[PDB]
Amino acid sequence: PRGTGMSVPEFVSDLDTPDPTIEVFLASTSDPVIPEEGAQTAGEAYENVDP
Amino acid sequence: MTCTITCWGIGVLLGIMTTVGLMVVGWSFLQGAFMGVLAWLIVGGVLAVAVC
Amino acid sequence: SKFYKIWLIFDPRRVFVAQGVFLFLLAAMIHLVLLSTEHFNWFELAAANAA
Amino acid sequence: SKFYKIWLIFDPRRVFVAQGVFLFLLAAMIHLVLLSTEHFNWFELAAANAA
Amino acid sequence: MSKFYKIWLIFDPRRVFVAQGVFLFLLAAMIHLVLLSTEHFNWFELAAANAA
Amino acid sequence: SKFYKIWLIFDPRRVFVAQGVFLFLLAAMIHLVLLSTEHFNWFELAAANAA
Amino acid sequence: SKFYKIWLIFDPRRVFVAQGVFLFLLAAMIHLVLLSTEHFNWFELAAANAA
Amino acid sequence: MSKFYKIWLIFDPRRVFVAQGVFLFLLAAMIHLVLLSTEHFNWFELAAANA
Amino acid sequence: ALLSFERKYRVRGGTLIGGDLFDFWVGPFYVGFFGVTTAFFALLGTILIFWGASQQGTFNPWLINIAPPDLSYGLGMAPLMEGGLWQIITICAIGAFVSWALREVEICRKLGMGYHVPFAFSVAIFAYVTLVVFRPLLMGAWGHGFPYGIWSHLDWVSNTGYAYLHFHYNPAHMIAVTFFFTTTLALALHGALVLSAANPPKGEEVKGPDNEDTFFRDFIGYSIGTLGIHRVGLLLALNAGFWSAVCIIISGPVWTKGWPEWWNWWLEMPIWPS
Amino acid sequence: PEYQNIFTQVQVQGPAELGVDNENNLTEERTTGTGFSQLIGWIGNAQLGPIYLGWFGIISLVTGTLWFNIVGFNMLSQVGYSIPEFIRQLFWLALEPPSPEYGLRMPPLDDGGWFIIASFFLLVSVISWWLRSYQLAEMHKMGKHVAWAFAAAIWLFLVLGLFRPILMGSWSEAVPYGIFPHLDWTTAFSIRYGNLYYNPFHALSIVFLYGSVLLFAMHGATILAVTRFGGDRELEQIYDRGTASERAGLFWRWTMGFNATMEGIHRWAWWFAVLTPITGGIGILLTGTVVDNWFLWAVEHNFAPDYTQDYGYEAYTTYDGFLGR
Amino acid sequence: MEETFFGNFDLASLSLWLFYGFFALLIYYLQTENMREGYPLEDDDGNTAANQGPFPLPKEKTFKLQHGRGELTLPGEDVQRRDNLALRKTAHGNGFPMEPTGDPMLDGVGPASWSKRRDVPELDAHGHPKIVPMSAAEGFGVSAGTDPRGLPVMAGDGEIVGLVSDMWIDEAEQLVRYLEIELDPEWGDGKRLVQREMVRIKSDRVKVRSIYGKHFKNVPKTKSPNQVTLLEEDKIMAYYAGGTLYADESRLEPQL
Ligand SMILES: CCCCCCCCCCCCCCCCCC(=O)OC[C@H](COP(=O)([O-])OCC(O)COP(=O)([O-])OC[C@@H](COC(=O)CCCCCCCCCCCCCCCCC)OC(=O)CCCCCCCCCCCCCCCCC)OC(=O)CCCCCCCCCCCCCCCCC
Ligand code: BCL
Ligand code: BCL
Ligand SMILES: CC[C@H]1c2cc3[nH]c4c(c3C)C(=O)[C@H](C(=O)OC)c4c3nc(cc4[nH]c(cc(n2)[C@@H]1C)c(C(C)=O)c4C)[C@@H](C)[C@@H]3CCC(=O)OC/C=C(\C)CCC[C@H](C)CCC[C@H](C)CCCC(C)C
Ligand SMILES: CC[C@H]1c2cc3[nH]c4c(c3C)C(=O)[C@H](C(=O)OC)c4c3nc(cc4[nH]c(cc(n2)[C@@H]1C)c(C(C)=O)c4C)[C@@H](C)[C@@H]3CCC(=O)OC/C=C(\C)CCC[C@H](C)CCC[C@H](C)CCCC(C)C
Ligand SMILES: COC1=C(OC)C(=O)C(C/C=C(/C)CC/C=C(\C)CC/C=C(/C)CC/C=C(\C)CC/C=C(/C)CC/C=C(\C)CC/C=C(\C)CC/C=C(\C)CC/C=C(\C)CCC=C(C)C)=C(C)C1=O
Ligand SMILES: COC(C)(C)C(=O)/C=C/C(C)=C/C=C/C(C)=C/C=C/C(C)=C/C=C\C=C(C)\C=C\C=C(/C)CC/C=C(\C)CCC=C(C)C
Ligand SMILES: [Fe+3]
């Protein structure tokens, strides 16, 4: 509520600076591949694959 | 006064110089300021006692 | 040519003390800001020049 | 050549003390600068040279 | 040009000289540092760019 | 060869007290910074030698 | 030699108390330093020796 | 060697004895506290250790 | 009315901008040009507080709460019932306080005494000014001022204090508090010194400055003197007001993080053998 | 500008003033050595006076050092006698009170046993110092106002560490002997018992604490304003008032409608200072023992404000908007 | 303890109301103790005012004055009242300032007004006069700061009136209380005292901005050159501060 000093002060420069690891994730992530009917699984393609 | 005030002025100038001198070689402003403040107390007091 | 009259209005002991502290602080400040720059840093240059 | 007249302006005791502590502080400051750098810090160089 | 000596009758020569003495240095130092602030007239980084 | 007359301007009891404080403080400071580095820390070298 | 002339400068009743507090403080500080190190902490060595 | 009696010609017996009495008790209390801190030399706790 | 000695000191003159137009006394109070503005600003601010209390729904002095606007309003004026009334009362409060200090200048100028009191009050004004108009500007919102309530402004101090994660570690708050405790300590000892000297046990002569001067010489080994205590005491109180202004002006616009984390410079130094 | 009497423009030094003395014969226990300091003379008297070596003072000094040392060596033992770590953590180390699971019983030395020993010596030193103030006023044939004003500080001192823990059922309620730790205790004490803002006696003590600083800025400036009329000589103005007392009174009579006398000012000055720990001592004494939650005490007594606005940041802004994206 | 009696009135409430009663008694005690000087109230005509306030005057307290100066009862018959004040009212009613009939500084009515103190010098613990010239001081000397002795005295308007001859020190508390001004024949005659709190000392000269050059010849004098009584001490200090408002019309007239 207005009045009571309930506020979170932050520097504008700090706010303008995002998390440096956000751009790292975007470079590593990728769109999922929707499986089709009768699609090969990791068990068939590779051996010693965890269940 | 006069001599004592001047000697204090030399210390605060030295304190400012040490504040930025340690900032150049690393440290931080607050860490450098404490050494600068400490330098001002020490050399400022010594100069105000020995020179005057 | 008549610059010698500056001592007629300035106390030689007062100006010399001011001159002495000013020159050293100016020399120290120029030296200090020089070390701040990476290019004009003889300490960092020697490490880079050696290896 | 006639620099001997500075003592007619500066008190010897007051100026000798002033430059007496100026030299030590300058020498300590220059020495401490060499500690800050890595190429001219003889303590780590001694450790590095000792394998 | 040379007839403006009447102004000096108002100022104390010591007071005006020390006031203008520190004024010129402060103005000169301020002009130098704003040249260091900009990315085009900072002669320290210009040497770095020139020397690659 | 004519340094004996430094005491003509310096009071012995006034400078001896300062010198005695300065020498011990300098000796302790050099000992302290020598203990800061791991190469010359004779207390840790003794521990490592007996290990 | 001729070191006895120091008493012509230093007051014996003011320097004896000066070294009296200094020697004990120096002795106490060095003892504390030894206690800080685990190699020379004779109190903890006795516990370790008993096992 | 045997001329140690002359220490009373400098120090008055009253002030040194009062300082000596406070120093010895504080030294005795300091050492006793140190042993009480260590688990090996805490004679009170090892009494509980012996059943 | 007048004291037994007040008649002589009641002379015309010693006014800043007013003249004989406002140069008169109402009862014991002295009205001046700035006493006119003080009366207007104080009454307007006081009435608007009760007008806001009426619209707030309660007249309980504990529960009356006129609060600054939301932070979304920024530095602009807010609706009167949404925080705008607090801004006007703040404007009235600044006018009332400044005029009160300027009136005190007129009081002491008429009496031929020094201007120490209005200067000392101005330090307390600066502490209020830095709390209500200086800190909000450095943050870009009038909503950072404390609300005008007996207990509401205690909630603001509590919330602002914990908004910086254990405010006790604020270095300027640390300096400001020890000035507050020392001033009260100095007030107790100084008040005790004069009363003890002037009021000895029954049947004993009153003690002069020498007897009270030597009491702390025998008590704490040094006495600052009759004149020294008043000037050191004024500086102790002014430093308390000034450092209180510092501890709150460096909270938000200088150190947005926690205050214990400020002390990381001491904990993390190259000298310390980590 | 006009000379403000903040720093003396010239100071004179003569023979050292030993004291006044009477048939109480304070000279034997009074030191014969005094010193002069010009740096402190710019604002006050330049003479470093001689201590009166009374037995209450000596006992207080000896036992006070014992408390100081005991806390110190436990602090030095906290970090294992590492002086650089001791200096680094000096503001953080403390001698913690006993654990709450011991009650009034004597706890082991490592778990607050040394706290009790240090507290006992601190109690003796503090009380002995008060007896020194009472005796010194008695030997000077002066009023005991210094002793009574000090006793008010003892009240909060005794409540914080002695009176409240005894009737709270545990020694753990005492204040830790640390720079930052007693700040942590100060905050944790308010948090544990609601909010000491809503403690009326804490509020009352704050009223007198602000008033004490307010008066001594008022009194300090007013005396310095009339110091051109010899207002610094308050005692002579009490016995025979001059224009300094009249102008100082009329300054505040014309400002706030009423004033004081040169003697009545110190009665006002004394009481707000004395009332600051007296009210605080009462509030701490009945905090937890009587009231265990001060905000809830405020709620039932109808002086806790109520807020009709939402309590979430989402109600005033959004996370993306705050970040500017 | 943890249980409440008649409602929500617990022991904390009982202590709070007990303090409220004590504080009300304390305020009555504190306010009354300040009524020992300047009361009963009066009006501008000098008669006793119809209103005396809500606080009655306290019981008579006695001070056993030292150095055989008798006793002193504060409430009643202030001996410091001045009889012949050179003022007359600017209004027939109350609450309006007085206008001095003659010279405000000479008569001492406004800021120049003094109080009829005792005509005896203030005494230290030894019984000797408290303020004495440094020439009569046994072993006193300037320890720090600028020594004003011999420095020319510059008035508020810039006139040079004379040089400082001596400083009247307070040997009991070891501080300077006055500066002796040896007036030049043009600006007056004899010596006059200026309090240290009203004087500003520079490197080469010493200046007072409160009094112009022409008013030093009218500064109140001292009967003896070795001591100053409280009456002269009050007259001297008041005169200099009176010039802060009466040196010229520009000071009395509004500054804006
Ligand atoms: C024009 C417009 C200008 C702006 C106006 C708008 C301002 C907005 C704010 C307004 C605030 C109020 C204004 C001030 C009042 C003005 C009155 C006035 O001008 O004429 C005065 C008028 C006399 O006419 P006069 O013009 O002065 O003529 C000269 C006199 O005849 C000759 O008699 P005298 O020589 O003896 O002098 C008279 C003097 C005599 O009075 C005194 O001696 C004062 C001494 C006590 C004051 C010191 C106490 C403060 C210490 C800390 C207080 C805070 C903590 C208290 C609570 C916690 C602890 C309980 O009276 C005064 O001068 C009044 C001064 C101000 C009084 C204190 C101000 C309030 C303080 C508390 C704050 C409350 C919040 C504000 C009020 C809310 C408004 C909405 O009547 C009075 O004297 C008032 C009576 C005094 C009050 C009673 C105090 C005695 C205490 C004992 C009883 C307490 C009972 C409570 C406890 C219950 C026990 C169970
Ligand atoms: C959780 C809370 C945090 C905390 C958070 C804060 C915050 C937040 C603040 C302080 C501030 C202060 N804190 Mg802190 N502080 C804490 C704990 C403490 C403790 C303690 C023992 O624990 C103490 C002693 C203090 C002490 C203080 C002082 C340094 C200061 C109080 C304001 C002041 O100086 O006046 C300053 C105010 C003024 C002088 C008011 C001026 C008054 C005007 C000019 C006149 C008023 C006239 C008015 C109209 C009345 C007239 C009406 C009648 C007619 C008479 N804090 C706790 C831990 N502290 C406050 C501060 O510094 O403010 C600058 C501040 O904002
Ligand atoms: C989050 C923190 C809590 C808080 C928790 C507490 C607690 C807990 C207490 C206070 C108390 C006080 N608080 Mg609070 N308080 C807070 C917020 C505030 C704020 C603010 C602006 O926010 C302020 C101004 C205050 C103000 C105050 C003072 C009114 C009061 C202490 C007076 C005092 O000094 O007693 C003077 C007495 C002492 C300080 C001890 C006396 C010391 C002895 C006599 C001297 C011994 C000397 C010693 C041996 C060392 C000697 C060494 C010498 C060098 C030789 N609090 C918030 C709510 N507050 C106290 C109280 O309640 O009073 C009722 C208290 O106990
Ligand atoms: C500032 C440095 C310290 C100090 C000094 C000081 N204060 C002073 C003086 C001095 C030297 C005066 O000369 C002056 C005076 O005359 O006091 C009697 C004064 C004064 N300081 C006062 C109070 C005060 N001082 C405080 C503290 C301090 N005093 C500081 C520690 C505090 C605190 C922090 O608690 C308070 C509350 C007054 C008694 C007085 C100022 C009188 C004045 O301003 O009168 C004119 C105004 C009115 C009569 C009413 C105005 C009303 C407004 C228009 C509306 C309301 C505004 C307000 C912000 C609302 C508050 C709501 C809630 C938060 C309660
Ligand atoms: C009315 C309430 C206010 C108040 C008043 C007050 N305090 C008082 C008095 C009064 C009237 C005194 O007369 C008394 C005094 O003498 O003051 C100068 C005092 C006092 N209040 C003090 C402090 C104090 N007051 C405080 C506050 C307050 N007290 C309130 C604001 C505070 C707070 C809450 O912050 C503190 C911390 C002291 C300055 C003093 C009490 C001292 C005293 O007489 O006994 C205490 C103990 C000692 C003197 C012994 C200490 C031990 C050593 C001197 C320290 C270590 C020395 C050295 C490092 C030894 C090393 C040995 C090794 C090398 C072996
Ligand atoms: C040794 O030296 C000294 C003294 O002793 C010579 C002293 O004493 C003092 C003073 C200190 C004391 C302790 C004395 C006693 C005082 C106190 C206990 C109070 C100080 C302590 C506090 C903790 C503060 C408490 C605050 C109080 C008591 C309130 C006082 C402050 C106020 C702002 C309220 C009073 C102001 C009012 C009512 C308004 C002012 C009036 C005007 C400006 C007049 C304007 C009028 C007009 C324009 C005309 C319109 C007229 C109207 C409407 C008619 C209405 C009439 C009215 C009267 C209102 C000091 C410092 C001192 O060192
Ligand atoms: C070179 O130095 C060496 C030598 C190393 C050294 O020592 C350095 C010492 C160093 C660094 C220690 C520095 C100490 C520090 C920072 C501590 C600050 C202290 C603080 C903040 C105190 C807060 C709390 C005070 C209260 C509130 C007490 C309450 C006391 C109560 C009232 C006592 C009541 C009595 C008892 C419980 C006993 C009951 C038993 C019996 C009666 C039998
Ligand atoms: Fe005072």
For residues I150 and I62, the answer to whether their CB atoms sit within 8 Å is: yes
Tokens at I239, concatenated? 């430093």
CA distance K234 to K118: 10
Chains sharing 3 or more CB pairs under 8 A with chain D: B, C, F
Comparing CA positions, the residue from G50, A39, J112, G34 lying closest to residue G42 is: G34
Tokens at K10, concatenated? 């617990």
For residues J166 and J289, the answer to whether their CB atoms sit within 8 Å is: no
* β-pair type (K152-154, K206-207): parallel
Residues contacting residue F43 through CB under 8 Å, at least 6 positions apart: F35, G33, G37, G39, G40
CA torsion angle E10 E12 E13 E14 (round to 10): -160
CA distance G42 to H31: 14
CA distance H39 to H32: 13
Alpha helices by DSSP H, B1-52: 3-24, 29-50
CA distance I35 to I28: 13
Comparing CA positions, the residue from I64, J293, J202, J192 lying closest to residue K16 is: J202
CA distance G23 to B15: 33
For residues B7 and I238, the answer to whether their CB atoms sit within 8 Å is: no
Query: J95 pairs with which residues across the strands?
Result: J177
Tell which atom from ligand 3 comes closest to the C-alpha of J209.
29
Comparing CA positions, the residue from H21, I113, H38, D10 lying closest to residue J62 is: H21
Tokens at J188, concatenated? 């944790």
Q: Which residues of I237-254 are buried (b: 16+ CB within 10 A; e: fewer)?
A: bbbbbbbbbbbbbbbbbe
Element of type H or E holding K196 = none
Tokens at A51, concatenated? 């269940």
Max Cα–Cα distance, chain A, nearest Å: 65
Q: SS3 for K195?
A: strand
- What is the 8-class DSSP label of residue E6? G
Comparing CA positions, the residue from J229, K241, K237, K97 lying closest to residue I2 is: K97
Q: Which long-range contacts link G27-33 to residues 24+ away (Cβ below 8 Å)?
A: G29/J83, G32/J76, G32/J81, G32/J83, G33/F43, G33/J81, G33/J83
Per CB-CB distance under 8 Å, the chain J contacts of A2 are 309
- The label of the residue with tokens 């006009």 reads J2
I205: left (phi over 0), alpha (psi -120 to 50) or beta: beta
For residues J198 and J297, the answer to whether their CB atoms sit within 8 Å is: yes
Q: Which residue type is seen at J299?
A: V
How far is C-alpha J137 from the chain's CA centre?
A: 20
Q: Report CA(J194)–ligand 4 centroid distance (Å).
A: 29
Residues listed for chain K: 256
Pocket test for ligand 4, best of I113, I121, I148, I158 (most atoms within 8 A of CB): I121
Q: SS3 for K148?
A: coil
Tokens at I122, concatenated? 């101005």
Element of type H or E holding K142 = strand K141-145
For residues B43 and D21, the answer to whether their CB atoms sit within 8 Å is: yes
CA distance E50 to I154: 61
CA distance J157 to J205: 14
Closest partner CB to J77 (pick from H22, H26, H37): H37
**CA-CA-CA-CA torsion sign (I156, I162, I166, I169):** negative
Tokens at G1, concatenated? 């030699």
**CA-CA-CA-CA torsion sign (K217, K220, K223, K228):** negative
Element of type H or E holding K147 = none
CA distance J106 to J114: 10
- The label of the residue with tokens 């707000």 reads J272
For residues K191 and K184, the answer to whether their CB atoms sit within 8 Å is: no
CA distance D41 to D49: 12
Comparing CA positions, the residue from F45, J69, H34, J114 lying closest to residue G43 is: H34
Tokens at F44, concatenated? 């840790």
- The label of the residue with tokens 């008035």 reads K155
Q: Which residues of K2-41 are buried (b: 16+ CB within 10 A; e: fewer)?
A: eeeeeeeebbbbebbeebeeebeeeeeebbbbbbbbbbeb
Tell which atom from ligand 5 comes closest to the C-alpha of J149.
11
For residues J90 and J179, the answer to whether their CB atoms sit within 8 Å is: yes
- CA–CA distance from I224 to each of I6, J219, J220, J226 (Å)? 33, 16, 14, 19
> Which ligand gives the minimal distance to the CA of I188?
5
Per CB-CB distance under 8 Å, the chain D contacts of F39 are 43-44, 46-47, 50
How was this entry determined? cryo-EM
Confirm or reject contact between H38 and chain G (CB < 8 A): yes
Tokens at I68, concatenated? 């600054």
Per-residue HEC secondary structure of chain I comes to: CECCCHHHHCECCCCCCCCCCCCEEECCEEECHHHHHHHHHHHHHHHHHHHHHHHHCCCCCCCCCECCCCHHHCCCCCCHHHCHHHHHHHHHHHHHHHHHHHHHHHHHHHHCCCCHHHHHHHHHHHHHHHHHHHHHHHHCCHHHCCCECCCHHHHHHHHHHHCCCCHHHCHHHHHHHHHHHHHHHHHHHHHHHHHHHHCCCCCCCCCCHHHHHHHHHHHCCCCCCHHHHHHHHHHHHHHHHHHHHHHHHCCCCCCCCCCHHHHHHHHCCCCCCC
Q: Which residue type is seen at J78?
A: Q
Q: Is C50 annotated as a binding residue?
A: no
Residues with CB under 5 A from ligand 8 (ion): J 234
Exposure on the CB side of residue I97, measured as CA atoms within 13 A: 18
Q: Report CA(J150)–ligand 5 centroid distance (Å).
A: 10
Per-residue HEC secondary structure of chain J comes to: CCCCCCCCCEEEECCCCCCCCCCCCCCCCECCCCEECHHHHCCCCCEECCCECCHHHHHHHHHHHHHHHHHHHHHHHHCCCCHHHHHHCCCCCEECCCCHHHCCCCCCHHHCHHHHHHHHHHHHHHHHHHHHHHHHHHHCCCCCHHHHHHHHHHHHHHHHHHHHHHHHCCHHHCCCEECCHHHHHHHHHHHHCCCHHHCHHHHHHHHHHHHHHHHHHHHHHHHHHHHHHCCCCHHHHHHCCCHHHHHHHHHHHHHHCCCCCCCHHHHHHHHHHHHHHHHHHHHHHCECCCECCHHHHHHHCCCCCCCCCCCCHHHCCCHHHHHCC
Q: Report CA(I46)–ligand 6 centroid distance (Å).
A: 17
Residues contacting residue I125 through CB under 8 Å, at least 6 positions apart: I97, I98, I101
- CA–CA distance from G30 to each of G40, H33, J68 (Å)? 11, 18, 21
CA distance A25 to A15: 20
For residues J187 and I177, the answer to whether their CB atoms sit within 8 Å is: no
- What is the 8-class DSSP label of residue K60? P
Q: SS3 for H22?
A: helix
CA distance J207 to K205: 48
Q: Which residues of H28-39 are buried (b: 16+ CB within 10 A; e: fewer)?
A: eeeeebbebbbe
Chain breaks in chain C (C to N over 2.5 A) after: none
Is the shortest distance between the CB of K37 and ligand 1 below 6 Å?
A: no
Q: What is the DSSP string of chain A?
A: --SS-------HHHHHS--TTHHHHHHH--PPPPP-TTPPPHHHHSSS---
Residues contacting residue E7 through CB under 8 Å, at least 6 positions apart: none
Chains sharing 3 or more CB pairs under 8 A with chain H: G, J
**CA-CA-CA-CA torsion sign (C42, C44, C47, C49):** negative
H helix count then E strand count, chain H: 2, 0
CA distance I92 to I94: 5
For residues K236 and K131, the answer to whether their CB atoms sit within 8 Å is: no
Alpha helices by DSSP H, G1-51: 12-36, 42-50
For residues J68 and J95, the answer to whether their CB atoms sit within 8 Å is: no
Chain breaks in chain G (C to N over 2.5 A) after: none
* β-pair type (K131-133, I29-31): unpaired
- CA–CA distance from B51 to each of D25, I45, J47, J133 (Å)? 16, 58, 23, 42
Comparing CA positions, the residue from I45, I230, G2, K94 lying closest to residue J237 is: I230
Cis ω before I273 (30° cut-off from 0): no
Q: SS3 for K173?
A: coil
CB atoms D37 and C16 under 8 Å: no
> Which ligand gives the minimal distance to the CA of J175?
7
Residues contacting residue F22 through CB under 8 Å, at least 6 positions apart: D24
Tokens at K184, concatenated? 């030049």
CB atoms J307 and A10 under 8 Å: no
CB pairs under 8 A between I and J: 327
End-to-end Cα, chain K, rounded Å = 65
Measured in angstroms, the resolution is 2.7
Q: SS3 for D28?
A: helix
Rounded to 5 degrees, φ, ψ at C15 are -70, -40
